[PDB]
Every structure is written in structure tokens, then in C-alpha cells.
Amino acid sequence: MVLSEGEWQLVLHVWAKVEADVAGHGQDILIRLFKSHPETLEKFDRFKHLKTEAEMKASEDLKKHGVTVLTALGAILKKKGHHEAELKPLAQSHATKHKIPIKYLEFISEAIIHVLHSRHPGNFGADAQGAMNKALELFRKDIAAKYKELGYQG
Ligand code: HEM
Numbered sequence: 001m002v003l004s005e006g007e008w009q010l011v012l013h014v015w016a017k018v019e020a021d022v023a024g025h026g027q028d029i030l031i032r033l034f035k036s037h038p039e040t041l042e043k044f045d046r047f048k049h050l051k052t053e054a055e056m057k058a059s060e061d062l063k064k065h066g067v068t069v070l071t072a073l074g075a076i077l078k079k080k081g082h083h084e085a086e087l088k089p090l091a092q093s094h095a096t097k098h099k100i101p102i103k104y105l106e107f108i109s110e111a112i113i114h115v116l117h118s119r120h121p122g123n124f125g126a127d128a129q130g131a132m133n134k135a136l137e138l139f140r141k142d143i144a145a146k147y148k149e150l151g152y153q154g
Contacts, residue, residue, distance in 0.1 A: 001134065001137065001138050001141065002081065002138075003080070003081060003131065003134055003135060003138065005080075006131075007130075007131035007134060007135070008080045008081075008131070008135070010127060010128040010131040010132070011077060011128070011131050011132050011135045012077065012078065013123060013128070014116055014120055014123045014124055014128055014132065015074060015077055015078075017119075017120050017123055018070070018074075018116070018120075019074065022067050022070050022071065022074075023063055023066065023067050025066075025070060025115065025119070026063060026065075026066020026067050026069060026070045027056075027057065027062070027063050027066050028115045028119070029066065029069075029070070029108070029111050029112055029115050030056075030062060030065070030066045030069070030111075031053060031056050031057065032111040032114055032115055033107060033108050033111040034047075034050075034056065035053060036107065036110075036111065037104075037107045040104050040107060040108075043098060043099075043100065043104070046061060046065075047059065047061070047062055047065075050062070072086075072090065073139075076139060077135060081138065083139075083142070084142075087139075087142055087143060087146060088146070090143070091143050091146035091147060091150060092146075092150060094143075095146075095147045095150050095151075095152035095154065096150065096152065099152070099154065100154070101154040102140060102143070102144050102147070102154055105139075105140050105143065106140065109133075109136040109137075109140065112132075112136065113129060113132060113133065113136075116129075116132065117129065
């Protein structure tokens with residue numbers, strides 16, 4: 001797939017608003033993910049034990065990780081499709097060390113779209129959501145292909 005420059009503009013316009021508070025958007029997205037699909041939380045030896053949303057909000061460790069994740073995703077989106085290099089180390093660790101199925105990447109995509117919708121309704125109308133969905137589908141397809149090359153394709 002290939003996004004047009006107008007679609008990347010819609011994606012990087014909302015992302016510029018997310019960057020005003022990377023730690024708060026990280027926390028909202030990871031919590032939405034763990035709450036909606038609790039099986040994803042098991043993948044984290046570090047956070048598994050958290051029982052409620054209040055516990056999740058108070059974890060400084062979970063908030064730091066959410067900044068790591070959003071920074072890595074932000075550097076991929078700013079490449080506008082030319083992300084081959086950034087994707088390599090990400091795909092290798094998530095397919096070999098953490099073992100994350102493609103279906104869990106769909107679950108966090110949904111979580112990102114839910115939080116942008118709530119926090120940025122003015123900059124995330126239908127056309128901008130369609131461009132963000134296209135940018136994440138592109139990311140998942142390129143990661144799926146690398147998984148296969150690495151021997152996991154999950
Ligand atoms: C937006 C998609 C995602 C991005 C950009 C991302 C990014 C990262 C980054 C940068 C790290 C640190 C370095 C690394 O180990 O490679 C990380 C670690 C990790 N990721 Fe992801 N990730 C994504 C999706 C997920 C999902 C959906 C799961 C599981 C449901 C997952 C599970 C893990 C685990 C278990 C670690 C290790 C955390 C720790 O103990 O250090 N990732 N991720």
C-alpha cells in the first residue's frame with residue numbers, strides 16, 4: 001500500500017498534537033489496550049501483576065514504557081513509508097524475544113485510534129481517521145512480512 005502526501009499530512013497533523021503530551025497519550029493508550037484485551041497484559045513480566053486501572057495509572061514504569069513505545073512509533077510515522085530500517089530491530093525483538101502475534105498489533109492500533117478520537121475530535125474527523133488507519137495497516141503489513149522473513153509470522 002501507499003499513502004498519498006495528503007493522507008500523511010492528516011496523520012502527522014494529529015501526531016503533532018499527541019507529541020504535546022507524549023507521556024499522557026502513552027498512558028491512555030496502554031491502559032486502553034490492557035483493559036480492552038487483558039490477554040495482552042500477560043506478555044509483560046514487568047506489568048502482569050497490575051490488577052486495576054488505578055494501579056496502572058500509578059505505575060511510573062508503565063508510563064515510561066508508554067513514552068518509549070510512542071517515540072518509536074512516532075519515528076516510524078515521520079518516515080512516511082520509508083521505514084525499512086526502523087522496522088528491522090522492532091520486528092526482530094517482537095517476533096523472537098517477546099513473541100507478539102499480529103493480532104495484538106491490531107488491538108493496539110484500535111487503542112490508538114480510540115484515544116485520538118477521544119482527545120482530538122477536531123483534528124480526527126473521518127478523513128483523518130481513515131488516513132491514520134491506513135498508516136497503521138501499512139505498518140502492520142510491513143511488520144507481518146518481516147515476521148515471515150524472520151521465521152515467526154504470527
Ligand atoms: C505500536 C506498536 C508497538 C511498538 C511501536 C512497540 C515498541 C516497543 C519498543 C520500542 C520497545 C523497547 C525495545 C524492544 O524490546 O524492542 C517494546 C518492548 C516490548 N513490547 Fe512493544 N511495541 C509495540 C507493540 C507491542 C504489543 C502490541 C505488545 C504486546 C501485546 C508488545 C509487547 C512488548 C514487550 C513484552 C516488550 C518488552 C517490555 C519490557 O519489558 O522492556 N509490543 N515495544
